[PDB]
Amino acid sequence: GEIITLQAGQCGNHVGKFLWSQLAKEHAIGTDGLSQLPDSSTERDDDTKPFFRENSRNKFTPRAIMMDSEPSVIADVENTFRGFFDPRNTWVASDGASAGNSWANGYDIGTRNQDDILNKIDKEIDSTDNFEGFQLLHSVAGGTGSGLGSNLLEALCDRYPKKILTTYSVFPARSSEVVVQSYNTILALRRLIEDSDATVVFDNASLLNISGKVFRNPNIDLQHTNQLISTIISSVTNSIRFPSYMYSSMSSIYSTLIPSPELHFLSPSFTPFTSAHKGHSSYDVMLDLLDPSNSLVSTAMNNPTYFNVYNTIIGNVEPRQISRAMTKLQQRIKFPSWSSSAMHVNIGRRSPYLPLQPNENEVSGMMLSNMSTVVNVFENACNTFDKVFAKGAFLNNYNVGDLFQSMQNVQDEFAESREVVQSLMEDYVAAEQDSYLDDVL
Amino acid sequence: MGGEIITLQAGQCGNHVGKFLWSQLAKEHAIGTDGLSQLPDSSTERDDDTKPFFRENSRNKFTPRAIMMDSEPSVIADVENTFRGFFDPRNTWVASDGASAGNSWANGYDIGTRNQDDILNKIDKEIDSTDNFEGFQLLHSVAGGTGSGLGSNLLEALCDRYPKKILTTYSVFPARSSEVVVQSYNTILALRRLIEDSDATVVFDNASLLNISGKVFRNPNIDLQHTNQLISTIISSVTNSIRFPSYMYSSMSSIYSTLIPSPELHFLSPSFTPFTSDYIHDDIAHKGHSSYDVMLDLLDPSNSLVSTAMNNPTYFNVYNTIIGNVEPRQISRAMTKLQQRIKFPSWSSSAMHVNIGRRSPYLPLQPNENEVSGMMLSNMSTVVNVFENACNTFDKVFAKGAFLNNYNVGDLFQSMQNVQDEFAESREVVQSLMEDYVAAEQDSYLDDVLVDD
Amino acid sequence: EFSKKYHVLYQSNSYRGISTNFFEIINDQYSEIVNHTNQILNQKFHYRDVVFALKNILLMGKSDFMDALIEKANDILATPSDSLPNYKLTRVLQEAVQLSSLRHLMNSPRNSSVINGLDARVLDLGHGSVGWDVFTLDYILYPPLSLVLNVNRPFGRKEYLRIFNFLWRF
Numbered sequence A: 001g002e003i004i005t006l007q008a009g010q011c012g013n014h015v016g017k018f019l020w021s022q023l024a025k026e027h028a029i030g031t032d033g034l035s036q037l038p039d040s041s042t043e044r045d046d047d048t049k050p051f052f053r054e055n056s057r058n059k060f061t062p063r064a065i066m067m068d069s070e071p072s073v074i075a076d077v078e079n080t081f082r083g084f085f086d087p088r089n090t091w092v093a094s095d096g097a098s099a100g101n102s103w104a105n106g107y108d109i110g111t112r113n114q115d116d117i118l119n120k121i122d123k124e125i126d127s128t129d130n131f132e133g134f135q136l137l138h139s140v141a142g143g144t145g146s147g148l149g150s151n152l153l154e155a156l157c158d159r160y161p162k163k164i165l166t167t168y169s170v171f172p173a174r175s176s177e178v179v180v181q182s183y184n185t186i187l188a189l190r191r192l193i194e195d196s197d198a199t200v201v202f203d204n205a206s207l208l209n210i211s212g213k214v215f216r217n218p219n220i221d222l223q224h225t226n227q228l229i230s231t232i233i234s235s236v237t238n239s240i241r242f243p244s245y246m247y248s249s250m251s252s253i254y255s256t257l258i259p260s261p262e263l264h265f266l267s268p269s270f271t272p273f274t275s276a277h278k279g280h281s282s283y284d285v286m287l288d289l290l291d292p293s294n295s296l297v298s299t300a301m302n303n304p305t306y307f308n309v310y311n312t313i314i315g316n317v318e319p320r321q322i323s324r325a326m327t328k329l330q331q332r333i334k335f336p337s338w339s340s341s342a343m344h345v346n347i348g349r350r351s352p353y354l355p356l357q358p359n360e361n362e363v364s365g366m367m368l369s370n371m372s373t374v375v376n377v378f379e380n381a382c383n384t385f386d387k388v389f390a391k392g393a394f395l396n397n398y399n400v401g402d403l404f405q406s407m408q409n410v411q412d413e414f415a416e417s418r419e420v421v422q423s424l425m426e427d428y429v430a431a432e433q434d435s436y437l438d439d440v441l
Numbered sequence B: 001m002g003g004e005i006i007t008l009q010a011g012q013c014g015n016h017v018g019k020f021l022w023s024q025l026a027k028e029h030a031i032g033t034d035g036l037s038q039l040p041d042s043s044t045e046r047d048d049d050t051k052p053f054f055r056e057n058s059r060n061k062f063t064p065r066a067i068m069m070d071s072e073p074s075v076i077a078d079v080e081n082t083f084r085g086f087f088d089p090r091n092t093w094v095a096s097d098g099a100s101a102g103n104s105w106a107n108g109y110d111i112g113t114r115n116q117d118d119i120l121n122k123i124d125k126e127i128d129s130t131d132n133f134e135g136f137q138l139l140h141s142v143a144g145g146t147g148s149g150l151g152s153n154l155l156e157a158l159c160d161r162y163p164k165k166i167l168t169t170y171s172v173f174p175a176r177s178s179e180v181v182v183q184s185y186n187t188i189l190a191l192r193r194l195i196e197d198s199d200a201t202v203v204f205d206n207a208s209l210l211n212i213s214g215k216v217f218r219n220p221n222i223d224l225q226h227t228n229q230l231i232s233t234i235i236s237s238v239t240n241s242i243r244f245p246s247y248m249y250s251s252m253s254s255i256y257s258t259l260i261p262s263p264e265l266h267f268l269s270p271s272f273t274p275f276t277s278d279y280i281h282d283d284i285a286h287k288g289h290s291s292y293d294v295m296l297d298l299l300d301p302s303n304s305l306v307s308t309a310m311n312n313p314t315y316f317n318v319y320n321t322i323i324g325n326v327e328p329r330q331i332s333r334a335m336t337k338l339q340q341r342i343k344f345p346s347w348s349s350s351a352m353h354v355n356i357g358r359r360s361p362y363l364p365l366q367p368n369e370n371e372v373s374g375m376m377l378s379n380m381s382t383v384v385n386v387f388e389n390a391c392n393t394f395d396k397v398f399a400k401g402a403f404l405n406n407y408n409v410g411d412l413f414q415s416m417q418n419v420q421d422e423f424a425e426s427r428e429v430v431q432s433l434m435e436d437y438v439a440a441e442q443d444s445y446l447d448d449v450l451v452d453d
Numbered sequence C: 001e002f003s004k005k006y007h008v009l010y011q012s013n014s015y016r017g018i019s020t021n022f023f024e025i026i027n028d029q030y031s032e033i034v035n036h037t038n039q040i041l042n043q044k045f046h047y048r049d050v051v052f053a054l055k056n057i058l059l060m061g062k063s064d065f066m067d068a069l070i071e072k073a074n075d076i077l078a079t080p081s082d083s084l085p086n087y088k089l090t091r092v093l094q095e096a097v098q099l100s101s102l103r104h105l106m107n108s109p110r111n112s113s114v115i116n117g118l119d120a121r122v123l124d125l126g127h128g129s130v131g132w133d134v135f136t137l138d139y140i141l142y143p144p145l146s147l148v149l150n151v152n153r154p155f156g157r158k159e160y161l162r163i164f165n166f167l168w169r170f
């Protein structure tokens, strides 16, 4: 049941810092790690064991490991959270600052210093007994981050074949670095196709747009984006962190969301939230979640083919409004003729040890979906990669180790990545059709 | 048969009329300009019904079921600043298209057709936010070219988007037009779509509005805000039958049943007694009138809101709504006196209709002189003269084709011949409307089915 | 308390018997008990409010509520409802009560009980007839309002029943 957070790259470090601050504010842990709750009452309804290891000093150390080639962001996080994290759970590869935004250098550093990471994760696992899997937070655009993520994914799949792995990948926005970052993105995508079990996608452009819409200042900061990522991760993990009757593990969530390991990419949405009045009921929250103006990914589709959806509503809700919103969603959303029209609603309790968020008494809702927008994003990324590769031969100039010894193997690996992502999008557009399950029907 | 009605404010005049109407309803139902009902949510017992016009999000807040659409963001920002939290900011449409490039109907039609997706999405959202719907109420404001074009585009979308909903429109006509040719062109292009798609249409001539605002008010100068105040009070009085539902008329369709004998005749004439909810309403307790005098004033041409020009007017469907402590004996006396004074057609024996409403328990009580007010809506063909003024302007100017360099841009036709043909079709359709009206004014209109079965 | 008070009163007045004091005490007792009964029936039971609700429901005094019920049960009146479990009919009636202006009374606690006092019973009138004809409204009273108000009693003249049938045809 215990999940270990893996913060890869400076993006991973930022999102981990934000998520741990949010979880401390929720479970009354603070920055010092000591239990901010009185020692007179031990009855608690939350679950901090899979995320926080409680020591004899009653301090809750976050079960997180930071793997990054840039020690500056790790030192900044340690300075901001002095007394929170464990110095033994810090890994900077002892190679200095980062150098090169390609996947090759990241994977080479991972393969070189895999022994230290393996020892760290083995110690973290042996510290407890009940284990379920790991949690990875990285960006597919960052070269070193993607390399470290691929290395740790390979290590996990060839060491612990029984632990389900979930990751959160934030795709880059429409910018200049996509001529080279697309290589790292498609390599991470191939690694996810090969070994990953669950992945939650994010689009940087859509995230920036949503943050600029919900915020007053249009100058959206990367810290604000990381705060939004922390909020969505807390909303999707509330069901595990506060288990009451139905949901007590991510296993059931991924069972009801992911139908097959070939389709293990999920698009999140969450509305409404701040980062002070109530104006949206549960029906309003559900229709806003359905509307593309509240999703954390770029839809770019008039009517996406919804395969599996699951929503968690936070707040005091009425079954009548729940049924009305469910009927409206069933009437609006179209489901394929081969897959069932399953719609799951989980009522997540609020944390009494968490300070009151702005816009009090406003019911909110998160929704994880599997539709044909992630495939549009993947198609855009693969088209950009194909264009830049077939037009300019510049990727053979920035490589390390085996990728630098010969550039032919690099082109072969990239062609294999393109082939596997093409097979993925073909399987997705086939599952979009009703003739997908015709082999048994 | 009672459903909710969504308000559609269009143009500057339409937005002002809608703002005044919403302020009047807030004053009546004790809602105020803050959106939060002045009455506590504990006293839920309400004789009225704000649900058809106010969406209840919270227990104390009532958001009006209205959408404003305009090309000038200044008036929208002013309205939103005056009504802090009262209106919904998501129901304000400006398209960031800047100021209107002239007073042409084609400009408004183009600015509606281009941003049709946004307004249609907003209408769909407003419809999904409710359950029981009956129809919309559009404020055309045909005096403005952009507003008339926007209203025509809205009507041409709603007719084939929701054919099962009854549509009512309010066309405000000016007294003396500044640019007579352009304003006549805009009014004719709006009346074309009104005849084509609009189910009910109420005209408001500014001549009688200026006359009433100069007579009943003390200040000689007339202001547009207190001019539109009269139209907003008229709209509130005609929607009272649904807001405070009476025992006979409680639905917009039920009201229009006795007012629209045929889809071709969908133009009415309003009339109202000296108002009591306006600014200068202190000079009302010195008239000393009764229900019979109220009926006489309603039937008098001096209290109508449109240019009467009564030359033996042929009445088709006359209806009246009296709000206050009304007496049945006085009602019967007024009916007996009016049946011997109102011209009635020999082919239809249908007489005038009387309805009695209820007064709001939170409105300021008036003395026994003007405690009872009345509204009258009559189907008179006198509006064909207001339309004949514009058609004569069209016939006297169209022989040359002036101001053709303004209606050519924006619309789907950039050539002069297409615009000329469209204006000729508009002239033909308004001529056919006037001919149908002058034929229904006679007895042969009913004899058409008697001579052929 | 009333019994004890007038008991000590009559105990003090026992030496007179039948006299003007006895007569005036009887008159005062009658006036006081009648005023108390009226106040109790108007406050704790809302006699006038129940009368208004009956005039609005049975006598169709609330035209808006009647039109709302008609537009809510129009499909039920259209289809033959002679053979139905009536649970959907009760649900439609509750939804119409919620949608009409009576939602204020439903939110009000005492008026909620006043509304729930209405029995959702339908008397089948006709074999395979239309739903409008087979529909019937049956009301059952409860003390202390039964001793005052009159309804369509099985041993009465069915005044409210025939009035409701006439208004129903109209």
Ligand SMILES: Nc1nc2c(ncn2[C@@H]2O[C@H](COP(=O)(O)OP(=O)(O)OP(=O)(O)O)[C@@H](O)[C@H]2O)c(=O)[nH]1
Pocket (backbone or CB within 6 Å): A009, A010, A011, A014, A068, A069, A070, A098, A100, A101, A102, A139, A140, A141, A142, A143, A144, A145, A146, A170, A171, A172, A204, A222, A223, A225, A226
């Ligand atoms: N949203 C968000 N993304 C970040 C943040 N920091 C880094 N990133 C990601 O990092 C990418 C840019 O590359 P780099 O910052 O050099 O990451 P890298 O290539 O792995 O290099 P290092 O971070 O030094 O290991 C962007 O595309 C982002 O996706 C952050 O604070 N917020």
Ligand SMILES: Nc1nc2c(ncn2[C@@H]2O[C@H](COP(=O)(O)OP(=O)(O)OP(=O)(O)O)[C@@H](O)[C@H]2O)c(=O)[nH]1
Pocket (backbone or CB within 6 Å): B011, B012, B013, B014, B016, B070, B071, B072, B100, B102, B103, B143, B144, B145, B146, B147, B148, B174, B206, B224, B225, B227, B228
């Ligand atoms: N009586 C009256 N007329 C108004 C009012 N507001 C606008 N109008 C009409 O509007 C005309 C002037 O043009 P505008 O007000 O700019 O209308 P428009 O040209 O369509 O521009 P927009 O309203 O912004 O779309 C006048 O001839 C008036 O008839 C008002 O408040 N009262």
